[PDB]
Amino acid sequence: FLVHSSNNFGA
Amino acid sequence: FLVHSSNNFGA
Amino acid sequence: FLVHSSNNFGA
Amino acid sequence: FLVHSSNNFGA
Amino acid sequence: FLVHSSNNFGA
Amino acid sequence: FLVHSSNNFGA
Amino acid sequence: FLVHSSNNFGA
Amino acid sequence: FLVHSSNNFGA
Amino acid sequence: FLVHSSNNFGA
Amino acid sequence: FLVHSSNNFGA
Amino acid sequence: FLVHSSNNFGA
Amino acid sequence: FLVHSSNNFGA
Amino acid sequence: FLVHSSNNFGA
Amino acid sequence: FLVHSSNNFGA
Amino acid sequence: FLVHSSNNFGA
Amino acid sequence: FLVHSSNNFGA
Amino acid sequence: FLVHSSNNFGA
Amino acid sequence: FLVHSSNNFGA
Predict the structure, then answer these.
(1) Which of residues 1-11 of I touch J (CB under 8 A)?
(2) Which positions in chain C touch B4 (Cβ < 8 Å)?
(3) Closest approach of K1 to chain L, Cα-based (Å)
(4) What does the DSSP 8-state code read for residue K2?
(5) Is the torsion defined by CA of K2, K3, K7, L2 positive or negative?
(6) For chain C, what is the total number of helices (H) and then of strands (E)?
(7) C-alpha angle with apex P11: R1 to O9, nearest 5 degrees?
(8) What does the angle CA N7 – CA O1 – CA O5 come to, to the nearest 5 degrees?
(9) Dist CA O9 CA L9 (whole Å)
(10) Backbone φ, ψ for residue G9 (5° rounding)
(11) Binary contact (J1, I10; C-beta < 8 A)
């Protein structure tokens, strides 16, 4: 199994 | 301007 | 599964 | 001018 | 599923 | 002049 | 489904 | 700009 | 078996 | 920039 | 058998 | 930069 | 039999 | 740099 | 029979 | 540098 | 029979 | 450098 998370933010 | 964000997680 | 969210704002 | 925004989430 | 919302305003 | 706006949501 | 609203005003 | 991050683990 | 984790962050 | 790390163990 | 571990970190 | 380490044992 | 261990570290 | 060590014994 | 051991260390 | 040693005995 | 032992050390 | 020694006996 793989647990994963990603996030991003921009302007 | 243009502000944006995203989040995700999975398994 | 993937849980995900996105947002944006502009002018 | 033109202001706009959006949000979403899913799974 | 996707829950989503959008808005805009202008003049 | 011309002012306008809209909103929506769905799933 | 989509719930939506729009408005405008001018002169 | 653009900020981003991710994490994961597995076995 | 392998247990593993990774992370990253940037801008 | 870009920061990253990882860990693992196994047998 | 082999038990093993590894780690790294960078920027 | 890049820092790294590892350990193992066996028989 | 052989029992053995190894380690390393760097940057 | 790179530091390393190992040990073993057997019969 | 032979009992034996070895070790090393470096940088 | 490189340091090393070994021991053994037998019969 | 022979009983024997050896050792060494270096750098 | 290199230091070494050995011993044995038999019959």
Answers:
(1) 1-11
(2) 6-9
(3) 5
(4) E
(5) negative
(6) 0, 1
(7) 30
(8) 10
(9) 16
(10) -155, 135
(11) yes
Asked if the Cβ–Cβ distance from M8 to N10 is below 8 Å, we say no
Query: Alpha-carbon dihedral of residues D9, E2, E3, E5, nearest 10 degrees?
Result: 90
Rounded Cα distance between K1 and H9, Å, is 24
What single-letter amino acid sits at D9?
F
Resolution (A): 1.4
Of C8, B7, D5, C7, the closest CA to residue A8 belongs to B7
**Which chain J residues contact residue I6 at CB under 8 A?**
4-6
- Interatomic CA distance for residues B8 and H5, integer angstroms: 11
Neighbour subunits, R (≥3 Cβ pairs < 8 A)? Q
Tokens of C9: 């704002």
Question: Tell me, what amino acid is at J2?
Answer: L
Query: DSSP assignment, residue K11?
Result: -
At M3, list the tokens: 């029992």
- Asked if I6 lies within 8 A of J1 by C-beta distance, the reply is no
How far is D9 from B7, CA to CA, in rounded Å? 9
- Smallest CA-to-CA distance from H2 within B5, K8, C9 is with B5
Tell me the β-bridge partners of Q9.
Answer: P5, R3
Q: How far is CA C6 from CA D8, E1, P4, in A?
A: 5, 14, 58
